[PDB]
Amino acid sequence: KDNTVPLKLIALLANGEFHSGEQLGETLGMSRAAINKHIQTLRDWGVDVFTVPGKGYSLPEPIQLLNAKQILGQLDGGSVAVLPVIDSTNQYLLDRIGELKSGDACIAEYQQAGRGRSPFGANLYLSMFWRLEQPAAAIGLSLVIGIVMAEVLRKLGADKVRVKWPNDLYLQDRKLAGILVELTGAAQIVIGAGINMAMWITLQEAGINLDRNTLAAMLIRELRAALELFEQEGLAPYLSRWEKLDNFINRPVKLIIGDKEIFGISRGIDKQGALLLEQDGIIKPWMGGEISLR
Numbered sequence: 001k002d003n004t005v006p007l008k009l010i011a012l013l014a015n016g017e018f019h020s021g022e023q024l025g026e027t028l029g030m031s032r033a034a035i036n037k038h039i040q041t042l043r044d045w046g047v048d049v050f051t052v053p054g055k056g057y058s059l060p061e062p063i064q065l066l067n068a069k070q071i072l073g074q075l076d077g078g079s080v081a082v083l084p085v086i087d088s089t090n091q092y093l094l095d096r097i098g099e100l101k102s103g104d105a106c107i108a109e110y111q112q113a114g115r116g117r118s119p120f121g122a123n124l125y126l127s128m129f130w131r132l133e134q135p136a137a138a139i140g141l142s143l144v145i146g147i148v149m150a151e152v153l154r155k156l157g158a159d160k161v162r163v164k165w166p167n168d169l170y171l172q173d174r175k176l177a178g179i180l181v182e183l184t185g186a187a188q189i190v191i192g193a194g195i196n197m198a199m200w201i202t203l204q205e206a207g208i209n210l211d212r213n214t215l216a217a218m219l220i221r222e223l224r225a226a227l228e229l230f231e232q233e234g235l236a237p238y239l240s241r242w243e244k245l246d247n248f249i250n251r252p253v254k255l256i257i258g259d260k261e262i263f264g265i266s267r268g269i270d271k272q273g274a275l276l277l278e279q280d281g282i283i284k285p286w287m288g289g290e291i292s293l294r
C-alpha cells in the first residue's frame with residue numbers, strides 16, 4: 001500500500017506550526033479537498049491534528065519522524081527497511097524469510113497490527129532477522145537483546161534503564177520496552193522490540209528525548225554486534241552485564257509459572273539465563289515464568 005501522501009503530509013505539519021490546506025495543497029499539488037482527505041488518515045493513525053477554521057491545521061507539538069536517509073546514513077551495510085507505517089515489523093520479516101540475511105532489519109513508528117499482545121510515532125519498532133547456525137539460543141537470546149538495548153539507551157543518556165528477566169526494559173519500575181522472539185523451524189529467528197518514546201512509562205515522560213534516527217541506528221549497529229558475539233560465545237560474555245542491569249536482582253519477586261505463584265528473592269541468572277530464585281535459603285534456577293515485584 002502506498003502511504004506516501006499522508007507521510008509527505010505529516011512531514012509538513014511536523015514543525016508543530018499552523019498549516020492551511022491552501023498552503024499545503026500548493027506544495028503537494030492538490031485540492032484542499034484532497035488534503036482534507038489525507039488529513040483524515042493522519043487522524044486515523046492517531047495523529048494529533050487540530051483544526052482552526054480561520055487558522056488551518058496543526059499538531060499539538062512538533063514531532064520527529066523516522067528518516068531512512070538519516071538512518072541509513074549512519075549505517076554500514078545490511079538491509080534495513082524504514083516503513084513509518086506498517087502492519088507489523090515482525091510480520092514484515094516473517095514474510096520475507098527466504099530473502100534475508102542475519103542482520104537485515106525493519107523500522108516503524110506505527111503498527112497497524114502488532115503481534116505479541118499506540119499512536120503513530122509514539123513508539124519505536126524494531127525487528128531483526130537472524131539465522132542461528134546450530135536453537136542455540138532462545139532464552140539466551142532475549143537476554144542479550146535487553147542488555148544491549150539497555151546499554152544503548154544508557155549511552156544516549158537514559159541511565160536508570162534496567163532489564164527485567166527475561167524480556168522487558170524497565171524505567172522507574174515501569175515497563176518501557178518489550179522484546180519478542182519468534183523461532184522458525186539452522187534456526188531462523190525474528191527479533192522484535194517496541195520502545196515507549198512518547199505519550200506505563202515513556203522516555204519522554206521521563207524527560208528523555210532521544211533522536212529516534214539515532215536510536216534506531218545505534219540499536220541496529222549494536223545489535224548486529226551483539227548477535228555475532230552471541231552466535232559464537234553464547235551468554236558468557238554478558239553475564240556480568242546482565243547483573244549490573246538486572247532490575248530485580250536481589251529483590252523480592254513473585255514468579256508466575258502457569259497456574260502457580262511462587263515467591264522468592266531474585267538472585268539473577270545462571271550461565272544459561274535461567275533465573276535464580278532463592279526460596280527459604282535455597283537457590284534454584286527457573287527456566288520459565290513471569291517475574292514480578294511483590
Ligand SMILES: O=C(O)CCCC[C@@H]1SC[C@@H]2NC(=O)N[C@@H]21
Pocket residue numbers: 087088089090091111113114115116117125126127177178179180191192193194
Ligand atoms: O508489545 C510488546 O510490548 C512486547 C512485545 C514487543 C512486540 C514487538 S513490537 C515490534 C515487533 N513487531 C510486532 O508485530 N511485534 C513485535
